[PDB]
Design a protein around this ligand. Structure first.
Ligand SMILES: O=C(Nc1ccc(C(=O)N[C@@H]2c3cccc(O)c3C[C@@H]2C(=O)O)c(O)c1)NC1CC1
Length: 167
């Protein structure tokens, strides 16, 4: 039993809810919140900008030190940093950005990072301003993640479409 509430169950391990992932992290304080990161951990907009803003820019400060030490992530890769006031940990995962021409096959590799954590609060990778089809992202998520994932979808219209079209 866990504290996530009001989710629709899609499969044995994947749950989804129309919710602002920022509001959901503050309320649950999950062990892991996933950020929709880029390779530079520059949290400007979309999900990333929102999570960083909620940390009063502490996420960005920590991220800049991480990059200065380690260099950029790989597309499809991840790193674990602090969850600040939102979660114990933040798993920064880089999905391909279609608006940069990145290979959509990297989306499966990106979701494989979730398998290193037993339970996660997460957004759909590569959706929103990353430019991929969210229906496809959900399919890849279900078919790749084996650990327990609770997906927050900000847009109600999109949430309904994801549920209604789910096979
Ligand atoms: O500002 C926020 N939250 C917040 C959450 C998500 C996002 C975001 O961009 N989502 C993305 C989005 C939007 C529309 C269609 C989409 O396919 C996606 C993918 C992604 C998502 O929905 O996962 C955001 O811009 C801000 N909270 C403050 C009031 C406290």
């Amino acid at each position: 039993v866990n504290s996530f509430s009001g989710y629709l169950k899609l499969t044995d391990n994947v749950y989804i809810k129309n919710a602002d992932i920022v509001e959901e992290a503050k309320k649950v304080k999950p062990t892991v919140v996933v950020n929709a990161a880029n390779v530079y951990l520059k949290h400007g907009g979309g999900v990333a900008g929102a999570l960083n803003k909620a940390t009063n820019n502490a996420m960005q400060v920590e991220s800049d030190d991480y990059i200065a030490t380690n260099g950029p992530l790989k597309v499809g890769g991840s790193c674990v940093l602090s969850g600040h006031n939102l979660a114990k940990h933040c798993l920064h995962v880089v999905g391909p950005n279609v608006n940069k021409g990145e290979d959509i096959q990297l989306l499966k590799s990106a979701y494989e990072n979730f398998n290193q954590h037993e339970v996660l609060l997460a957004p759909l990778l590569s959706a929103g301003i990353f430019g991929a089809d969210p229906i496809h992202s959900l399919r890849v998520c279900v078919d790749t993640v084996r650990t327990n994932v609770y997906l927050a979808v900000f847009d109600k219209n999109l949430y309904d479409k994801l549920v209604s079209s789910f096979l």
